[PDB]
Amino acid sequence: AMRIVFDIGGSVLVPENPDIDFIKEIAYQLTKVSEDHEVAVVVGGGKLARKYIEVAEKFNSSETFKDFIGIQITRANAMLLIAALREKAYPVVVEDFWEAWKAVQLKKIPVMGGTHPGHTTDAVAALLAEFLKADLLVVITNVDGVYTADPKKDPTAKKIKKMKPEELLEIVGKGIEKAGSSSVIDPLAAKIIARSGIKTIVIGKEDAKDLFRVIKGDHNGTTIEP
Amino acid sequence: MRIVFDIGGSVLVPENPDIDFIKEIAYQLTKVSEDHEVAVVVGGGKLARKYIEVAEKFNSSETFKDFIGIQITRANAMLLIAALREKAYPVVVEDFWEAWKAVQLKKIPVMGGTHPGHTTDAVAALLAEFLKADLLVVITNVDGVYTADPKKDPTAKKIKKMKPEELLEIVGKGIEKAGSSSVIDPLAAKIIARSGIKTIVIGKEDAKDLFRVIKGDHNGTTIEP
Amino acid sequence: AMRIVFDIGGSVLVPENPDIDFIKEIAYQLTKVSEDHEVAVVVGGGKLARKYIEVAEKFNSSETFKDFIGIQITRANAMLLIAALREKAYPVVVEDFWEAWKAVQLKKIPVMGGTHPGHTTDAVAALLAEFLKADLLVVITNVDGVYTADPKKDPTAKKIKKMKPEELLEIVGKGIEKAGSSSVIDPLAAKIIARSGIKTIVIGKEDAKDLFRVIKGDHNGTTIEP
Amino acid sequence: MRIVFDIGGSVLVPENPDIDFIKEIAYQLTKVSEDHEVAVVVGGGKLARKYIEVAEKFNSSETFKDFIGIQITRANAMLLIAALREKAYPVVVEDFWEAWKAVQLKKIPVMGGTHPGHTTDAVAALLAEFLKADLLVVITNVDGVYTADPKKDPTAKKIKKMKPEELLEIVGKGIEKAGSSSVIDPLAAKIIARSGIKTIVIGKEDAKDLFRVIKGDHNGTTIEP
Amino acid sequence: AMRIVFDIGGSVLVPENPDIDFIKEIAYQLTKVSEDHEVAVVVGGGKLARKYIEVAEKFNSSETFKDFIGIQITRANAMLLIAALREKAYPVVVEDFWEAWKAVQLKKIPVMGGTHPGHTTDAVAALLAEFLKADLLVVITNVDGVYTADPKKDPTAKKIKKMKPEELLEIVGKGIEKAGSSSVIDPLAAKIIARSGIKTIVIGKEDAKDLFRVIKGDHNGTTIEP
Amino acid sequence: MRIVFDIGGSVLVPENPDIDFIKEIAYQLTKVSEDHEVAVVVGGGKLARKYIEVAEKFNSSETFKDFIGIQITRANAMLLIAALREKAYPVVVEDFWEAWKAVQLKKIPVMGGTHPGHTTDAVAALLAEFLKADLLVVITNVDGVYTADPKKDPTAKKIKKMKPEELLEIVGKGIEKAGSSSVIDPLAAKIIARSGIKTIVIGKEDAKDLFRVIKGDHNGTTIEP
Ligand SMILES: Nc1ncnc2c1ncn2[C@@H]1O[C@H](COP(=O)(O)OP(=O)(O)NP(=O)(O)O)[C@@H](O)[C@H]1O
Ligand SMILES: Nc1ncnc2c1ncn2[C@@H]1O[C@H](COP(=O)(O)OP(=O)(O)NP(=O)(O)O)[C@@H](O)[C@H]1O
Ligand SMILES: Nc1ncnc2c1ncn2[C@@H]1O[C@H](COP(=O)(O)OP(=O)(O)NP(=O)(O)O)[C@@H](O)[C@H]1O
Ligand SMILES: Nc1ncnc2c1ncn2[C@@H]1O[C@H](COP(=O)(O)OP(=O)(O)NP(=O)(O)O)[C@@H](O)[C@H]1O
Ligand SMILES: Nc1ncnc2c1ncn2[C@@H]1O[C@H](COP(=O)(O)OP(=O)(O)NP(=O)(O)O)[C@@H](O)[C@H]1O
Ligand SMILES: Nc1ncnc2c1ncn2[C@@H]1O[C@H](COP(=O)(O)OP(=O)(O)NP(=O)(O)O)[C@@H](O)[C@H]1O
Ligand SMILES: O=c1ccn([C@@H]2O[C@H](COP(=O)(O)O)[C@@H](O)[C@H]2O)c(=O)[nH]1
Ligand SMILES: O=c1ccn([C@@H]2O[C@H](COP(=O)(O)O)[C@@H](O)[C@H]2O)c(=O)[nH]1
Ligand SMILES: O=c1ccn([C@@H]2O[C@H](COP(=O)(O)O)[C@@H](O)[C@H]2O)c(=O)[nH]1
Ligand SMILES: O=c1ccn([C@@H]2O[C@H](COP(=O)(O)O)[C@@H](O)[C@H]2O)c(=O)[nH]1
Ligand SMILES: O=c1ccn([C@@H]2O[C@H](COP(=O)(O)O)[C@@H](O)[C@H]2O)c(=O)[nH]1
Ligand SMILES: O=c1ccn([C@@H]2O[C@H](COP(=O)(O)O)[C@@H](O)[C@H]2O)c(=O)[nH]1
Ligand SMILES: [Mg+2]
Ligand SMILES: [Mg+2]
Ligand SMILES: [Mg+2]
Ligand SMILES: [Mg+2]
Ligand SMILES: [Mg+2]
Ligand SMILES: [Mg+2]
Ligand SMILES: [Mg+2]
Ligand SMILES: [Mg+2]
Ligand SMILES: [Mg+2]
Ligand SMILES: [Mg+2]
Ligand SMILES: [Mg+2]
Ligand SMILES: [Mg+2]
């Protein structure tokens, strides 16, 4: 009954290597969810992308060129999902929004990676959600939600349950994102979510193992909403 | 030296195209490219906002509104290309590597927008970053960066020199929406900050003599690490 | 029951600025007409295109380059229609005929602008009609029909009701069209219409406010037909 | 000087490719590019009409028939590219800006068709217009423009010099259909007229010495404002 | 009930010139076969391609460039089929597999020619069959089947009825294919057919005049199968 | 001289990228391009096989597995491009004519894969053939071509010199599947044979001094008609 965009982190799909079972599992659920909803997906780069970006840095590449290498990896990861989605997926990695649109019209799941430098795949997901006028944006990261601070660094981090887009920006928004930089949601994405008021859900791997219920409201993550 | 110029659409096209300015700026750019490598990106201006407003009355997404804006920036870019005559890359550049090619051919590439979510300011910063340019010159409607909006606030004072971090405080928090204005868009500010791109912000008057501006002789703002 | 191509003049959609209500109105009718017919559209450049072409002339650009600037504006205008067509339109501006074809297959209205230098959007519309083997080509200009001469210049201009393609060429056909030049139908278009015998209707803004009836034969314009 | 050559497919491929001519014309072009900037567009010829006739038996639209013709012109263009060896742009040029690039690289770009509705004659005129070429040389099956069809009418007389307006009277009225022939297609005639492109029409014999032709030494027709 | 890829030789469609009736006939049957099956096609270059490649050789072009000229001709031939297929065909010549896929989704017959140098249209057909996970690959050549040797050269040539992919490679597989070179199935194609076990049928023009039955198993050609 | 280098992904990326090697090979290439025209193609390596294996667990066709492999080869190509800094074409080359352009700009083009059905070895051979290169240098995990697999067979002997026909016997029969390895893939072997491309096969040690390798001073294999 609705349109949903999924932003799956590269480190979730590829922790250090591919998590075969998670991919097979996540691909199965997206397929099921697409049985009654319009589904579009964006995959991240993760550990592997940072390794290639670190190499380029050793050669002093510009931050723009590293972004491109990062983009190249995200597309590689995206192809692993497309593979696991079998015939329900759009064969090739989508590179622009209009094409994602066509895939949806053909009732096939479009899987895309990065687009242009200056941001992360989160921003791609947000803009996609916005372009398709999606009803839900599901961000699957390697943290169970959005906290008061970095849950892996701070001990007093509070896992916010609900919040406004303006509140999400306060958390991030002021971050100077370098090629390889990581966050729950990149500053640009936050601004896009706030900009047009995109209902957004942030969840971890554990909760991501039950998407069908997650998109029903039953999950233990954060819910950014106007 | 490698220099990237970010010319505001409102400066190039106030209401209708500003022939005289386009013309004078074309001569400056031509003069500068004689001893320097020049690349250029142009904005949307009044025309971009007008078409974006129409799309708004039809409830278009912000993403589609951005695309329309990008289309307008490319049309404006073509007017500058016309002005530069034989010193310009004949077509609107849409990728950074193509700009690189243009430069390899001793030609001036003129870009318009690229993708949604930001403005041409970001395109010019990314381009400067990409080409490892020595300098980014931003030509806009104000003569520099002020402590506040010079056209609104009476207490606004011009900041002659600052660091990316400071420029960031003056901006970076505004959520850029289709057609939104800013002395420098947030994203562009973060790009400049992340790479430490030497940036100069000047107005139309200073633009009349880019040869002096690139030497630090201007009344605008200089931003550098 | 049929396939129709609409050639809407840029000066009709954008007299000096956008005519919001006409666009909203025209977009609504095309949507309705597409409920039972296959619809494809081409939009012109109008006043705005001539302003940009005039600027380039001051810099002595070649007629080819001005054509390109003209093309750039037509695509901008086309996006305003796509905007007003909402979800019934193909998201991006179509640039070639094969793509217009796909849009039609997806049962979405393809809106295109110019293609290559040397002509006007009229020629694009005619070739489109021809490519899709359309049954009707509807040219909406800022004149109520094809006259014996320019209705805005000559006082003895006769508003022909019907005519043959060979007759339309006599009117135009011998025109040397420069970048920015305007006419009821450019010489090339005329030749295409005559070439394959495309049933063509030319109408003004007033009549264009009732397309549904116009495509039924009830209108006060001209009807070029084999 | 900047020169654009419009070589008829029927001259290049009469029935089968004309090896000797392709070969000799390649040498002339190579010789000319030594001191001039050279760009080239090739037509479809006998082969184009043959494939177009087949599509006709299947009731294809004139537009699709044009596309097929364009495909043939590009194949022919590749034979000339082969002939020019290292002096040519390695691939068939399809845009005018790419032709421009080729020229910037001191390479000879060879184009085939572009879009439906006209022929390669128009492509060469638009290209000449685009590059602001000094001269457009049309090599065809006749040795010049005559008052009438030289291969049909006994009274046809060769016109040594004329203006675009006159060339226009001799053509411009014919409704160009897929594969239609003409000493110069109407659209091309209007392009030449609108920009005042100095044009020279010559046959195969004169083609053997392009170095003399570009100096005005030929038995063909010269068209200029 | 199945997906079929047809590899039609250029010399079969264009012996020396186009065989109008064979094309009209072959186009009609493919249309009928597509009524109940998913059909995709690849056309060859034939005599004409070799003529252009021979010309380039006289100018000493590299084998790669000749491959490109060969490719250009195959696309020309492909357009003749598209023409004969009328509205049941995808309008433009397909150049990559993903696009062939879309055409099939739109339930239109995708007709493609060559892709990249180094091989023949046979290899394109095999890889296509493989990409679409086709159930049958039908190779229509100008010989009634795969023989022990060249039926036009050797007098003791045995027309094998059935065989394994590994057996087909023994026949070919070791061939050094130059631009313009011809064979029942190019070495690369053979390897692709063997690689993923593609059920393949090789037939001549005569048998090709009854595709519907051919795809049923009733034909007098060869049947390469795992 | 015109030289094409075919650097194995496993040499460039054994497990993780081999910084030191990438770095050293970048210097060699830079040194060589000083007096020669250089073009490069990089393979997939360990990473390509890893992603291809994952796709295999999902029953992907061999064609899709090839595409994934091509994507990995392009990522690796970008690491080399980074290493070559200003001497390289800024983006991954995907067509042979673009490689040609890069060379026209005195820049080093680095390609990854192109189409399915073969490996990067074939891409480099076709590229060498295309550019009419004087030499094809294949850098891999072994130090030359042996009578048998040097890492398996104890009797394997290194062949110092041979003809395409002989190289063909040692390979050419293996049915290349997604991610399959070979000192030289069959298709590449047939390309080398059909045009008679002078080819040199060397290992990582010799790669450290490409200036000597291109002169015939190496411990690898030389293949030529
Ligand atoms: N307030 C916060 N709440 C939750 N996570 C936070 C917060 N602040 C910082 N983080 C960090 O965000 C990380 C999350 O996202 P990130 O590493 O960027 O992965 P990803 O986006 O899922 N993957 P990919 O697309 O491949 O980069 C955590 O593991 C934290 O280190
Ligand atoms: N602190 C400040 N310093 C200078 N200008 C400011 C400041 N704060 C706000 N502004 C505004 O910034 C405007 C500047 O830029 P902007 O309108 O976005 O034009 P542009 O970027 O030159 N054009 P274009 O590319 O077509 O949008 C001024 O005219 C002010 O209204
Ligand atoms: N015989 C005629 N009948 C009707 N109009 C004529 C005739 N002869 C000349 N004209 C002119 O044609 C004009 C019409 O078309 P034109 O100005 O080119 O607008 P358009 O094609 O609708 N717009 P666009 O696509 O943006 O250029 C009129 O307003 C007349 O000045
Ligand atoms: N007045 C004329 N002067 C010269 N030729 C004429 C004239 N009128 C008609 N023609 C015809 O023009 C033909 C010329 O051009 P055409 O057959 O179209 O060849 P092409 O343009 O050289 N080839 P291609 O690009 O492959 O079509 C002659 O052979 C005549 O039959
Ligand atoms: N063992 C064999 N069995 C059958 N044909 C064979 C065999 N060995 C060699 N051939 C040759 O294969 C030829 C067949 O294919 P070929 O000439 O390449 O045409 P094609 O592939 O149908 N056309 P195209 O795609 O345009 O090249 C025959 O006419 C024989 O000369
Ligand atoms: N006769 C032979 N001579 C040399 N190597 C051989 C021979 N036969 C088999 N091999 C194998 O060839 C391997 C060589 O190449 P390969 O593993 O495919 O790496 P690569 O091509 O350098 N890398 P990439 O482009 O990423 O695949 C060796 O390590 C051997 O296991
Ligand atoms: O649209 C995109 C997607 C990715 N990246 C580059 O790829 C990295 C990996 O992406 P992700 O995993 O962080 O989303 C980013 O940090 C970044 O430098 C971009 O520049 N733009
Ligand atoms: O890379 C770009 C350039 C422009 N725009 C759209 O064009 C407008 C006009 O650009 P500018 O004048 O603001 O730079 C922007 O505000 C915006 O919506 C983009 O989305 N992305
Ligand atoms: O396919 C096209 C469409 C438009 N134009 C240029 O755009 C102008 C505006 O188009 P229109 O409004 O006249 O159709 C034309 O006069 C002309 O120079 C072209 O060259 N080719
Ligand atoms: O820019 C072009 C070039 C060629 N053709 C098609 O190719 C034919 C062969 O071209 P030529 O030999 O007539 O120039 C034309 O008659 C025609 O149908 C076009 O449509 N447009
Ligand atoms: O994907 C392709 C298709 C065709 N060709 C060139 O076209 C010729 C004609 O193709 P075909 O008729 O042999 O299939 C081939 O022999 C060859 O040199 C290629 O290089 N690659
Ligand atoms: O032109 C190419 C290059 C690479 N690959 C895929 O990438 C793999 C990795 O390439 P390489 O390391 O084997 O050269 C190949 O085995 C294969 O499946 C291709 O299909 N075609
Ligand atoms: Mg992410
Ligand atoms: Mg994230
Ligand atoms: Mg700007
Ligand atoms: Mg700004
Ligand atoms: Mg119009
Ligand atoms: Mg009109
Ligand atoms: Mg011609
Ligand atoms: Mg002609
Ligand atoms: Mg074949
Ligand atoms: Mg065959
Ligand atoms: Mg390799
Ligand atoms: Mg190998």
The verdict on a CB contact (< 8 Å) between D173 and C173 is: yes
Give the number of whichever ligand sits closest to the CA of residue B124. 15
Q: Which residues of C touch D55 (CB under 8 A)?
A: none
Q: Which residues of F touch B96 (CB under 8 A)?
A: 90
Report whether D131 contacts D101 (CB < 8 A). Answer: no
Residue nearest to atom 17 of ligand 2 (CA): B181
Q: Which tokens sit at A3?
A: 């349109």
Q: Which residues of A touch F55 (CB under 8 A)?
A: 79-80, 83
Report whether F197 contacts F125 (CB < 8 A). Answer: yes
Whether C and A touch, i.e. at least 3 CB pairs below 8 A, reads as yes
Query: Exposed/middle/buried for B43, CB within 10 Å: 0-12, 13-18, 19+?
Result: buried
Q: Which residues of E touch C3 (CB under 8 A)?
A: none
Q: Which residues of B touch C55 (CB under 8 A)?
A: 17, 19, 22, 79, 82
SS (H, E, C) C11-42: HHHCCCCCCHHHHHHHHHHHHHHHHHCEEEEE
How far is the first Cα of chain F from the last one, in angstroms, to the nearest whole number?
A: 18
For tokens 């190509």, what's the residue?
F77
The dihedrals phi and psi of C19, each to the nearest 5 degrees, come to -95, 75
C-alpha distances out from residue A175 to A114, A170, A178, F22, Å: 19, 10, 9, 33
B66 is in an annotated binding site: yes
F146 is in an annotated binding site: yes
**How far does the CA of residue A173 sit from the closest CA of chain B (Å)?**
7
Give the span between the Cα atoms of A44 and A114, in whole angstroms. Answer: 8
Cα-atom radius of gyration of chain F, to the nearest Å?
16
Considering only CA atoms, which of D141, D155, D138 is closest in space to residue D221? D138
How many CB pairs lie under 8 A apart between chains C and E? 8
Q: Which residues of A touch C106 (CB under 8 A)?
A: 102, 105-106
Three-class secondary structure of residue A125 per DSSP: helix
% helix / strand / coil in chain C, to the nearest 5?
45, 15, 40
Q: Which tokens sit at D191?
A: 């392009």
Contact with chain D for residue E17, Cβ under 8 A: yes
A147 is in an annotated binding site: yes
Contact with chain F for residue B208, Cβ under 8 A: no
The verdict on a CB contact (< 8 Å) between F195 and E127 is: no
Amino acid at D126: L
**How far does the CA of residue D185 sit from the closest CA of chain B (Å)?**
27
The verdict on a CB contact (< 8 Å) between B105 and D101 is: yes
Domain containing C171 equals 1-226
Residue nearest to atom 28 of ligand 1 (CA): A143
Task: Name the residue in chain F with its Cα closest to that of B96.
Answer: F90
Give the number of whichever ligand sits closest to the CA of residue B179. 8
Q: Report strand pairing: C3-8 vs C136-140.
A: parallel
Three-class secondary structure of residue C151 per DSSP: coil
Give the span between the Cα atoms of A205 and A85, in whole angstroms. Answer: 18
Contact with chain C for residue D172, Cβ under 8 A: yes
Amino acid at C36: D
Residue nearest to atom 13 of ligand 7 (CA): A120
Across the interface, which of B117, B122, B172 has its CB nearest the CB of A192? B117
Q: Which residues of B touch D100 (CB under 8 A)?
A: 90
Give the span between the Cα atoms of F222 and F225, in whole angstroms. Answer: 10
The dihedrals phi and psi of D112, each to the nearest 5 degrees, come to -120, -145
Contact with chain D for residue E2, Cβ under 8 A: no
Sheet hosting strand A3-8, strand order edge to edge: A111-112, A38-43, A3-8, A136-140, A200-203, A222-224, A162-163
**How far does the CA of residue D139 sit from the closest CA of chain C (Å)?**
22
Atom number, ligand 10, closest to the C-alpha of residue D69: 7
Burial annotation A177-196 (CB, 10 A radius, 16+ → b, else e): bbbbbbbbbbbbbbbbbbbb
How many CB pairs lie under 8 A apart between chains A and B? 71
Three-class secondary structure of residue E135 per DSSP: coil
**How far does the CA of residue A176 sit from the closest CA of chain B (Å)?**
5
The dihedrals phi and psi of C24, each to the nearest 5 degrees, come to -65, -40
Contact with chain F for residue E127, Cβ under 8 A: yes
* DSSP H or E run through F45: helix F45-56
The verdict on a CB contact (< 8 Å) between F78 and A72 is: yes
Q: Which residues of C touch E91 (CB under 8 A)?
A: 97-98, 101
Experimental method: X-ray
Q: Compute the CA torsion angle B175, B181, B186, B189 (nearest 10 deg).
A: 180
Residue nearest to atom 7 of ligand 4 (CA): D149
B20 is in an annotated binding site: no
Q: Helix F62-84 vs helix F45-56: angle between axes, to the nearest 10 degrees?
A: 160
Distance (angstroms) between ligand 13 centre and the Cα of B73 equals: 30
Cβ atoms within 10 Å, residue A155:
6
The verdict on a CB contact (< 8 Å) between C106 and A101 is: no
Residue F158, strand partner residues: F146
Q: Does ligand 6 have an atom closer than 6 angstroms to the CB of F112?
A: no
**How far does the CA of residue B63 sit from the closest CA of chain A (Å)?**
5
Distance (angstroms) between ligand 12 centre and the Cα of A111 equals: 22
Across the interface, which of C97, C98, C105 has its CB nearest the CB of E106? C105
Distance (angstroms) between ligand 9 centre and the Cα of A190 equals: 41
E3 is in an annotated binding site: no
Partners of chain F (3+ Cβ pairs below 8 A): A, B, D, E
Distance (angstroms) between ligand 17 centre and the Cα of C108 equals: 22
Q: Does ligand 4 have an atom closer than 6 angstroms to the CB of D186?
A: no
Which CATH number do you get for residue F91? 3.40.1160.10
Residue nearest to atom 7 of ligand 6 (CA): F149
Amino acid at C47: K
The dihedrals phi and psi of F143, each to the nearest 5 degrees, come to -95, 10
Q: Does ligand 8 have an atom closer than 6 angstroms to the CB of B42?
A: no
D179 is in an annotated binding site: yes
* DSSP H or E run through E80: helix E63-84
Q: Does ligand 6 have an atom closer than 6 angstroms to the CB of F45?
A: yes
Report whether F184 contacts F202 (CB < 8 A). Answer: no
Contact with chain F for residue B2, Cβ under 8 A: no
F153 is in an annotated binding site: no
Residue C1, strand partner residues: none
Give the span between the Cα atoms of F208 and F202, in whole angstroms. Answer: 10
Report whether A10 contacts A47 (CB < 8 A). Answer: yes
Q: How many CA atoms lie within 13 A of B116 on its CB side?
A: 26
Considering only CA atoms, which of C162, F75, E145, F27 is closest in space to residue A76? F75
Report whether C202 contacts C220 (CB < 8 A). Answer: no
Query: Exposed/middle/buried for E156, CB within 10 Å: 0-12, 13-18, 19+?
Result: exposed
Atom number, ligand 4, closest to the C-alpha of residue D147: 1
Considering only CA atoms, which of B203, B214, B164, B209 is closest in space to residue B7? B203
Give the number of whichever ligand sits closest to the CA of residue A142. 1
The dihedrals phi and psi of F134, each to the nearest 5 degrees, come to -85, -25
Atom number, ligand 8, closest to the C-alpha of residue B177: 18
C-alpha distances out from residue C27 to C79, C129, D14, F99, Å: 12, 19, 51, 47
The dihedrals phi and psi of A109, each to the nearest 5 degrees, come to -80, 115
Across the interface, which of E23, E68, E83 has its CB nearest the CB of D64? E83
* Count of domains observed in chain D: 1
